[PDB]
Amino acid sequence: VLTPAELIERLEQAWMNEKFAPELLESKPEIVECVMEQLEHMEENLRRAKREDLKVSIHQMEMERIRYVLSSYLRCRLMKIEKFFPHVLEKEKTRPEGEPSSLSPEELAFAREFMANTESYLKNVALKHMPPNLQKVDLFRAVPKPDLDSYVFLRVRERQENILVEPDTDEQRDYVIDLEKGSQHLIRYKTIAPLVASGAVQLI
Amino acid sequence: DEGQARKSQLQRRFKEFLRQYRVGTDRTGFTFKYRDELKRHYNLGEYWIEVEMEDLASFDEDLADYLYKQPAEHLQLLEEAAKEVADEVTRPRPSGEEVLQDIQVMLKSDASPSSIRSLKSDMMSHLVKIPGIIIAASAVRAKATRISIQCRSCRNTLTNIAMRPGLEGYALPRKCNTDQAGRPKCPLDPYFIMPDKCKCVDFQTLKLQELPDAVPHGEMPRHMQLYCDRYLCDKVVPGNRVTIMGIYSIKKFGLTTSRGRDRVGVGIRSSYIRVLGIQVDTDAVSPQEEEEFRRLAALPNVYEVISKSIAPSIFGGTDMKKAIACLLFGGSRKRLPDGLTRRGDINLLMLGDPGTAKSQLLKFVEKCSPIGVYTSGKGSSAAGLTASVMRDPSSRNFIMEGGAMVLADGGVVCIDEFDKMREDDRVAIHEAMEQQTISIAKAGITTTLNSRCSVLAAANS
Amino acid sequence: MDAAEVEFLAEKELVTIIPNFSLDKIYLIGGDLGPFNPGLPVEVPLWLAINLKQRQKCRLLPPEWMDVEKLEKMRDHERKEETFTPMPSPYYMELTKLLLNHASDNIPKADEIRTLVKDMWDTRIAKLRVSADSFVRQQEAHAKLDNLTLMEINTSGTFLTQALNHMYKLRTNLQP
Amino acid sequence: WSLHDSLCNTSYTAARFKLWSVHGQKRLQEFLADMGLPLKQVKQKFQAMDISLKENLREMIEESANKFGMKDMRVQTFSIHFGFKHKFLASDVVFATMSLMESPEKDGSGTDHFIQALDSLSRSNLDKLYHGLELAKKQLRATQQTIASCLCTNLVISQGPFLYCSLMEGTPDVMLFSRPASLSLLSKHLLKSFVCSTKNRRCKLLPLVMAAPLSMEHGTVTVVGIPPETDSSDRKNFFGRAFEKAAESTSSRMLHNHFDLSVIELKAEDRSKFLDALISLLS
């Protein structure tokens, strides 16, 4: 079991990773549930305290900071879900059992509702009035996919060796580098995405 | 040594002013105003800054006092300090930007101006602030900042000789420094200037006329010569009303009396102003202004608002004030593929009874138009309205001088007393009013000028 | 990320204050904040320090590295070197701004400190500009930026990354 | 401002030099000559003036004023400095705040003018303070012009027990003095100038009643009363109760809305009537 301070540390780490990643990252139900529970317990405890105290104000300020971080993180995830909904749903549909999910159940319900609402609107406003063979729009092709070739700044948390930098399509130009702990690099996201997933690097 | 120490101390103080000056408060925030401006301008490739005298006085009153009393030396020290600070703000620099550039320091103040008439001898070599109107501008010419000289006989060279700013020359060495032994002596005046070794800046000369309201009763307006250089060059054009900060100075020509100088009076000298800063008076758009203009254009009654703003002192004339608004804005000039042009300017004639504010309307439009010229038909001629051919005093050749409709190009020309104009003079305006050009074929000059102006005329029946 | 969020991150750094009130140990989710006793120093996060100062409850103490001699040595070293040198704090600019804006009465020689921090910031920004120009001009695929702080990266990161994305797409046009 | 403008627009020096007169300008020139200050320097903005003249300015001004019959040129006050630039005397801040609050720019309401004035007192809104300084300069010039118009035309007429001056709608700047606070301050400055510039000894020991138009729709006039102007005045005012007693005895339509009882709103037609009662009440 994590200490509460470590829990807030992981919350901030996920916040920044989601803020800079070009795609929807992996869901973290434990972090969200634990943080919400911590906020609820702190609110209850403060309800037992007197209003005039300095301690109550300090506790409230800390809770405000935690709440802001959680809200911003969830907003970022929701924006990504709305931007790429067909592809998010497709990835979730065909996921292997062992592999971790990128959607919480509630996010999944939200995404399904978003897709159905948008499709029904498009059908009812224009597509039903088009010629019979033009009535189907494949939303999978109409909505752009995440661009995984984006450049990101990262800080190394755990040393990594033999990372393959590919400057272009030509193989002969590709070379290899080392990532040392504490070092900071600017590199394409596609090369280092598994390291973001495992926690070896932090996106800044 | 002692003079060097004093100069170094003053330069250090100027440098500290540039490094440390700040604007703001502890409630809001703070900005290192001049250091930041220097850093941004240098990155943009614009090697100049403008310094407020009040800020310098706030940092160090003695520095401002020295700059006012002895502008030349202390301005040079301030420019050196500016160059030093520009290196520190931008010091690691990208390839092809190794060489540090000189910085021109402009001067600006909030003090009340003084008139041309008030410029007296006791103010010579001082910093002065003068309002006026630009009446003439010269061509852009090259002025040496650094020269290298070479000996005719021995090819001995002296390099990187600094030049004085302004309208001041240089006296070459009389004798060469080569060894007397072995070689036949070098001739007197052995040194010549090496063309390709010279570093030059752009320079300009201007005539500044006194403000019309400042002229004493019954006197012709006076003017003064202005010397501009570097980024001050080509900023103003004839017709601009300006306030200039500068050094009241004297032309330093050769000491010798070459061509047997024979002046009508002895010990007389020619004065001029060495310009250190220019401020154009209303009589680029900031983003705040642009947003405000977009707000005005979107008002549902903008047409009514503009009409109400035209000559608000006149009691009625709502339809004539609406038509003048259209003339001020104008139409769209077009060029068709075949090369034929369609004009976008609007011409308006007021023909009517006496004492109906026709002249007052013309006077307002002169002030309101971005470019506006007021003339009288009685006091005009065909050459005066379009353009004239005359002899150049210096060259002994024919030149061209533009008239009212060349000075009003891109704006409005208000012709009062249009009925009093002679028929031969009126007829000279037909081409300019429609084709918007002036064709000249006289005295060996065959050229065409632009006259894209709107005519606003008034006359009696 | 915007600058307010980098400042939010910077506000989690620990500073020392002397309170004028008494309070028992506080068990914050982030971590315990020791007992507060009038006249004695205690370590708290920067956000709480600023809040207590604004409410007239504490006096702030400058960090150890906020010393004119040390800062002058650091500025000289930064100017001498070619890469980025290690900074006294990962949020030196934000800490300087907050502390000097809110507690200059508590920090002697605040003007000199501000000027030295400004000098360091200018030098490092110029080094970052050189790095970006070299990245684009030489057509690199990767770069190392050690000892660079979050605020420095955030000042021009979006522009550089967008330019690099466009340049990569232009470099990979011909691949079918 | 410039030293010349400050001398011309300060009620103290402006009243003692009688600058509304033709000989007052000559007296001011004599004062400046006694100082040894070049005219072009005193007409320049104080900040831009040469520093050598500023070294002993307060002492020399005090000495010259003493020679010219002004013994109270110097006052104990306070100043505040911050930054490199910002320096203010207390009275400057007072004047700027007053001008922001009593601004004649009617695009903004009076609750809107109150908000501007309150904001200006915070160092974050420094631009508002400078704007208020400019407005204060304009208001001071207007005050001096109105005082000159009143004194030159003999508009301050002595009834038995008090002096009476009435502003008319033909007056140019009347709009700037319709608000009660501006009218009160103007009346005090006018009384000081009048007491300095009058010959009759009796009229120097009288209080003042001043009226100015308020609303041309309802025909209402603002009436203010101030006590006699003396160097040791207790600053005590009896006009509120006198006004209430005159209105009751005469049955005029008066409104007490100002927090000061010496400022009233009166129906213009009743005015004449009102005044007679007041006279009979105070004589």
Added chain:
Amino acid sequence: FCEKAMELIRELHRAPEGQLPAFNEDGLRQVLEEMKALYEQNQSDVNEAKSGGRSDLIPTIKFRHCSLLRNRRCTVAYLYDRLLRIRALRWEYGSVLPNALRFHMAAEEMEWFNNYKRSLATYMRSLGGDEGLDITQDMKPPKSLYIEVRCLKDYGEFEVDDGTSVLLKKNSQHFLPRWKCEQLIRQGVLEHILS
């Protein structure tokens, strides 16, 4: 050919700040009518190609099919961009829209907005034990627990706590907790005073 759909696209492109113009009903109907005309001509051409074995008509059929696809693409892009602007409305103003903004939207767009609003409310309710977390608040990092607010317009009663309310009238000032004033500040009803 596809110039009407190009007008549809240009209208939106000319307003890159996200404002919602009035729904272009006539333009949409024009595009649909053109699509029907193209489809009928193509159908006649296809029938003739089958009947008489004329190969020369195939390029014309391809040309018309491409034109139809272009019209469809422009229509769908226009509608989707409008949906994006409407979605932004929810996060910028709130759950209840001003009537001025409601006027520009089509009825089907209002139905879409209502459905999206319901889905967002459900998700926000599902996060926590009770009432969940309303992630439409806390849009900026917090600094102080309390703030000073000035009323920019008359608004009437405003509930601080269930027990107590305060009357919002123009140019009054209140010292209040930030989390109760954030929404009204974002809507332009209150102004945040810094001193």
Added chain:
Amino acid sequence: AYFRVESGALGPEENFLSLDDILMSHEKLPVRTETAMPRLGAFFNAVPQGSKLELPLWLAKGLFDNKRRILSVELPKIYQEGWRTVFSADPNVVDLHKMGPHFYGFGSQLLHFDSPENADISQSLLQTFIGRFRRIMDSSQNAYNEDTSALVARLDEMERGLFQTGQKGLNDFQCWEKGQASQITASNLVQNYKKR
């Protein structure tokens, strides 16, 4: 919270829902017709074989096939050797706004037609971007509270996006340093709706 669909013109295919891509593909492109085209003569009744026409890029992309059955495509003059040589001399002085607002996006999509000059078009587009980067970066990050009309006059649509990003970064830091980044303000849309 409003983010339009982004351009995909520099990639292998453009984005279906991108307004910029639709406007870009509206632009014309010279073609030569390789087959008689009946019943469309009214719009250019048959169009004879070998005729020369200007078609929108979307229409040319639809009819084009690698074996050149219906039409063959010719490059616009802007992408031919004559102008490529001008670009190499100094890419900073060419006005890419007048020479096609979507200069890079249009040139990128021309590579779909398998011209013999594909390698030269590709290399030119890259060098032009590299040769113009420093000026774009400097002007965007150092023009503060000034008129930028002359700084973006010659930039194309893709470059104007970068310039806006650079200005945003400069403005955000200036606001933070001046203490304006902490005030809670009315939303951007509310400001543009209720005060514009």
